[PDB]
């Protein structure tokens, strides 16, 4: 058993705040990490960002530096692939570099919007992580599905994790969306999330799992706070994490609410994998 943290954050083309620990520790809204397990530094940290204005060299240092402050360890980068403002990085608890083997990165571009990928071996178990940024727009669902198909075809596993700004929107007008959000009734909204719909229609992410979403749409917020959406773009769960395990436990899945540099909130996910 190992702990694989996964984070996806569309940073709205603006640098991050110097402290994003609530992202690392799965603190905020949704299925957050309990008061005890948060103190257990995870074995692998995967950081997927879109519209990331920071440079590859420095962004990795911000990540590796932030991890040391939290864990008191010097996590070891395994791979880091970037495609314009789309960047992904993988770090590992230093006491497990010998376990890693056959590290591989890849990329695919559609349009910037695309997908960066990383895969490696941990003991006799292989992993794959895909950080994407699909076509935006309320009425471009077929485009997003086709973007997913290209990535699934143009990329170069025992456990496969697909995350990023999938950009799927809600099929409901703003009046009812805000009404349901104010009551924290997300199920009526989730029933009309395009990603759920496209999965339930067996059109994309076939046999992919996603943890129950119990946090509010991560988009689109006004920069500076979380108590308000900038819907003039209906709120939507643009930023998602799905997995497909060979014939996995999800100890958390949510978003922060104290990181307010972007119009997206950071989304996190932690898993215990074999």
Give the key terms.
five-stranded mixed beta sheet, seven-stranded mixed beta sheet, 12 strands, hydrolase, 20% helix, globular, alpha+beta, 274 residues, monomer, 33% strand
Description of the molecule:
- The chain is an alpha+beta fold and 274 residues long.
- It is globular.
- The chain has six helices and twelve strands.
- It has one domain (1-274).
- Strand 6 (100-109) and strand 7 (114-122) form a beta hairpin.
- The strands form two sheets. It has a seven-stranded mixed β-sheet, covered by helices on one side.
- The protein starts with a strand and ends with a strand.
- It has helices at 21-24, 56-71, 141-154, 174-182, 187-190, 194-200, and strands at residues 2-10, 29-31, 44-50, 76-83, 86-92, 100-109, 114-122, 125-133, 159-165, 239-245, 249-255, 267-273.
- It comes from Homo sapiens (Human).
- GO terms for molecular function: actin binding; inositol-polyphosphate 5-phosphatase activity; phosphatidylinositol-3,4,5-trisphosphate 5-phosphatase activity; SH2 domain binding; SH3 domain binding.
- It is found in: Cytoplasm, Cytosol; Cytoplasm, Cytoskeleton; Membrane; Cell projection, Filopodium.
- Keywords: Actin-binding, Cell adhesion, Cell membrane, Cell projection, Cytoplasm, Cytoskeleton, Diabetes mellitus, Disease variant, Hydrolase, Immunity, Lipid metabolism, Membrane, Nucleus, Phosphoprotein, SH2 domain, SH3-binding.
- Belongs to the inositol 1,4,5-trisphosphate 5-phosphatase family.
